[PDB]
Structures are given as structure tokens and as C-alpha cells.
Amino acid sequence: MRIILLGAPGAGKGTQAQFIMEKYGIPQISTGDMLRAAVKSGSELGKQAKDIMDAGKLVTDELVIALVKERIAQEDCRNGFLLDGFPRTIPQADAMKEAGINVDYVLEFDVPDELIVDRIVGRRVHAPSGRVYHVKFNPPKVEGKDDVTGEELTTRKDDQEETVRKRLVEYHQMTAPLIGYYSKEAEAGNTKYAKVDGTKPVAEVRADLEKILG
Ligand SMILES: Nc1ncnc2c1ncn2[C@@H]1O[C@H](COP(=O)(O)OP(=O)(O)O)[C@@H](O)[C@H]1O
Ligand SMILES: Nc1ncnc2c1ncn2[C@@H]1O[C@H](COP(=O)(O)OP(=O)(O)O)[C@@H](O)[C@H]1O
């Protein structure tokens, strides 16, 4: 099974991707997580990406496409994968289509801007692993600590309020057109398309996605 999750930054995609990976046994392919890992490792890609992500801008399509191409060639993706934050632009979607990669489900998260801004304020990450929490809506079991390692949680540099505003503007300009892109693919019979109300509690969105995916 192959899935794309579509939605604004902060819509809840990475949170729900964890549950899908656990139940359906397919890896989460998050280009944000992979780019942050490149920074953490000090790879050449990481050297290029850090300043761009910190500014709330998109990394070049050609670099991200190559990153995803290599990732999905790895053994753990042989039987499917979940794309989370990719494709992010029409050229990224066209590259995957040109490559001959169809997906089985495209799942769109419907969340208004007003809620995203307010919501991202509380996002906390365990920076080494990428595990994601919210101080209120999905808190760690011990305040400020990762559930697995007990290490202190951090705030992402690009989650600062002014950067979030910029990121959202760019989402609507560059990324929201993928809604029509994959709606059209579904009309052609190339994928199934569904939209979930991502303003509901985490558990309710999870149940809605479980009903769609079986
Ligand atoms: N597919 C992509 N194309 C270009 N840049 C990307 C892509 N995925 C992630 N990024 C970069 O990583 C940043 C953070 O993205 P992401 O981790 O998906 O955060 P969020 O879930 O808040 O949108 C983006 O603002 C961009 O700089
Ligand atoms: N349904 C929800 N209601 C409230 N908060 C949520 C929900 N889903 C996720 N969150 C929290 O809001 C923030 C953004 O969720 P995240 O999964 O990181 O979104 P994305 O991957 O789309 O950027 C995180 O801090 C997360 O814990």
C-alpha cells in the first residue's frame, strides 16, 4: 500500500502517519524529517537545507526528488510506503507520475489557517528521533520529556510564529494545488481520494482514517 497525506503544515499529518505505519506496516517517508536528519548528520544536503528550512522556504524540487527517490529504493519500502510532506509542489508530483509511481490513497487533512497558527505554538519534538507531541492536544506522559528516551523535548526553529505564517502562505501558493491534482488522478481511476476533518481530536481523526484504509 502507498499513501500520500496532503494538508497544511500543522494539520496533523505526521501524528497520523505514526498510527498508519504501526497498523499497516508501511514506513513513514517524511521529507521534513529526512531533511532535518541530514542537518543532524552534517551531510552535504544538510549543509544546503538548514538555512532554507529555518527561513520557511521550500528546498529545491530537484534535491528533494532525489532524496525521495533514494529513500523509496530502500528495502523497507518494497511493499509500500506513506508519503508525508511530499510531493509539496506540482513539479514534485509530476516527477513521481513521470517515474510511473501511482499511489493507492491520497488523504487530505482539512484544517483552517486560524487553527494551524494557534496549534503549532504547542508543537514539541524529541529532536533526535523526530517524535512529535503537543503540550495540550497530545502531551507527553511526562511534561517536557520524550516517552521513549526521557530526553528533554525541543521546539523546531521553523515553528516560530512569523516563520509559520510565511510557511502557510507558501503552502497555499505552491502546495494546495495538489488537491486538484490528485482529485483529477482519482477521477481517472489512478488513486482513491478522501478528505478528513483534521480539527477533530487526534483519536477521532485516527478512527476516520482507519475506516478509510480498512
Ligand atoms: N517535499 C518538500 N519539498 C521542499 N521542501 C520541503 C519538503 N518537505 C519538507 N521541506 C522543507 O522542510 C520544511 C519543514 O517541512 P515539514 O517537516 O513537512 O513541516 P510541516 O509538517 O510543519 O509542514 C519545509 O518548510 C521545507 O523547508
Ligand atoms: N487532531 C489534532 N488536534 C490537535 N492537535 C493535533 C492534532 N493532530 C496533531 N496535533 C498536534 O498539532 C501539531 C501539528 O501536528 P503534526 O502531526 O506535527 O502536523 P504536520 O505533520 O501536518 O505538520 C503537533 O504538535 C501535534 O501534536
Author numbering: 1 to 214
What's written in the study?
AdK is a housekeeping enzyme that is present in all kingdoms of life. It maintains the cellular energy homeostasis by catalyzing the reversible Mg2+-dependent interconversion of ATP and AMP to two ADPs. Escherichia coli (E. coli) AdK has three subdomains: a core and two flexible substrate-binding subdomains, denoted ATPlid and AMPbd. The latter two domains fold onto the core region upon substrate binding, thereby leading to an overall more compact conformation.
